[PDB]
Short mmCIF file of C-alpha atoms in Angstrom, two decimals:
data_model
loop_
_atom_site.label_atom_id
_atom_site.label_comp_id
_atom_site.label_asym_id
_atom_site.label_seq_id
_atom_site.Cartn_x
_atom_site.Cartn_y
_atom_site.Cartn_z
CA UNK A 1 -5.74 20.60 45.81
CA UNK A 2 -8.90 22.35 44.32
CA UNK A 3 -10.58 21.08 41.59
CA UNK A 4 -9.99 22.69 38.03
CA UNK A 5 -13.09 23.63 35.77
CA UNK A 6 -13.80 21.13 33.07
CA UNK A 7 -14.20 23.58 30.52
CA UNK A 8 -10.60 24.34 31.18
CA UNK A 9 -9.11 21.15 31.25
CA UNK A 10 -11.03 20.47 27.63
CA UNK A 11 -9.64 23.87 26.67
CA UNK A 12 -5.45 23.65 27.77
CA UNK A 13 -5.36 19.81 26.18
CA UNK A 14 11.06 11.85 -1.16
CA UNK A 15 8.40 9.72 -2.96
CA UNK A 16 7.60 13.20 -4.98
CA UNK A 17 10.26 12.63 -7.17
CA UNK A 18 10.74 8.87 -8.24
CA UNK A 19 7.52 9.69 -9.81
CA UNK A 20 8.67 13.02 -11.54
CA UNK A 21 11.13 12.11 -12.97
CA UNK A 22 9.82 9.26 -14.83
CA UNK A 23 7.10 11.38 -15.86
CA UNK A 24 9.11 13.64 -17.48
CA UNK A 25 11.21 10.95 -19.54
CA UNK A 26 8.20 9.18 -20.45
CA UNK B 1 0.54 10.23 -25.36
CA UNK B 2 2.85 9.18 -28.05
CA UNK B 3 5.97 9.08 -25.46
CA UNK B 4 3.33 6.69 -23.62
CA UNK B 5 2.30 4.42 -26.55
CA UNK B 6 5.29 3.08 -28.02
CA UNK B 7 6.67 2.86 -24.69
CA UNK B 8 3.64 0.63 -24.09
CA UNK B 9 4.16 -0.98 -27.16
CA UNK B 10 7.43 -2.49 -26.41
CA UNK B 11 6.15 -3.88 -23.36
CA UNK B 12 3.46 -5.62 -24.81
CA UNK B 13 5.80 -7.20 -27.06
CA UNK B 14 8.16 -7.99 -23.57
CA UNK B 15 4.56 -10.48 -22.68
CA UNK B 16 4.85 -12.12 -26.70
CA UNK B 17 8.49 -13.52 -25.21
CA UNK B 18 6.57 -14.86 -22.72
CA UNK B 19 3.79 -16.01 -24.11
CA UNK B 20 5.61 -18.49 -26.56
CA UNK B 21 7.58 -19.22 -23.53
CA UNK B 22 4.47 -20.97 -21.88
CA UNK B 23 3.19 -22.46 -25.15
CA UNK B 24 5.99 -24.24 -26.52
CA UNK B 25 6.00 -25.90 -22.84
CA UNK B 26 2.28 -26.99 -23.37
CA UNK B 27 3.68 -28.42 -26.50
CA UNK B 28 5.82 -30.45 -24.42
CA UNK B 29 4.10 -31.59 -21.04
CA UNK B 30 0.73 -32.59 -23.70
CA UNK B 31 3.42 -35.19 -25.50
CA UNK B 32 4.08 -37.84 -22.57
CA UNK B 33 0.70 -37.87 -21.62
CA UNK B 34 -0.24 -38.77 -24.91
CA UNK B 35 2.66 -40.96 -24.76
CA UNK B 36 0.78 -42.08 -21.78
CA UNK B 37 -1.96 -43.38 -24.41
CA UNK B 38 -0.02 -45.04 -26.97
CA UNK B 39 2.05 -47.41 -24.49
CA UNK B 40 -1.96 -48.53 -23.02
CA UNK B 41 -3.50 -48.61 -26.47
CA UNK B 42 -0.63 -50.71 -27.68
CA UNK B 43 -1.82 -53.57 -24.92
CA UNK B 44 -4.88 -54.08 -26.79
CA UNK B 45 -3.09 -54.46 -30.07
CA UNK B 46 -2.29 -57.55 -28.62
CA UNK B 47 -5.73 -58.49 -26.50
CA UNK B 48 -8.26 -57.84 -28.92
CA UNK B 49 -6.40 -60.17 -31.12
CA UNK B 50 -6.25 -62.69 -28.56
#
């Protein structure tokens, strides 16, 4: 039940391809 | 470019079915409301006379 430093608590805490490959047909 | 443009151009002509599709119903819903003018201005081929 001691206190921790502060400075130690701030320191521990597939829609690629449906346009492919209509890109490459058209 | 060209792969785009007459792939574009066949969609443009995919709006020209439409288009005529809304006119030719102009050409229809205009007609009884001018119909709704004859059957009134036909009254006062009878009035005026009187």
């Amino acid at each position: 039940s001691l206190p921790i430093e502060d400075n130690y608590i701030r320191e521990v805490v597939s829609k690629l391809m449906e346009c492919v490959n209509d890109a490459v047909q058209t | 470019l060209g792969k785009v443009s007459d792939k574009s151009r066949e969609i443009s002509e995919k709006y020209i079915e439409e288009s005529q599709a809304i006119i030719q119903e102009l050409v229809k819903l205009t007609m009884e409301k001018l119909e709704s003018k004859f059957t009134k201005l036909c009254d006062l081929e009878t009035q005026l006379e009187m």
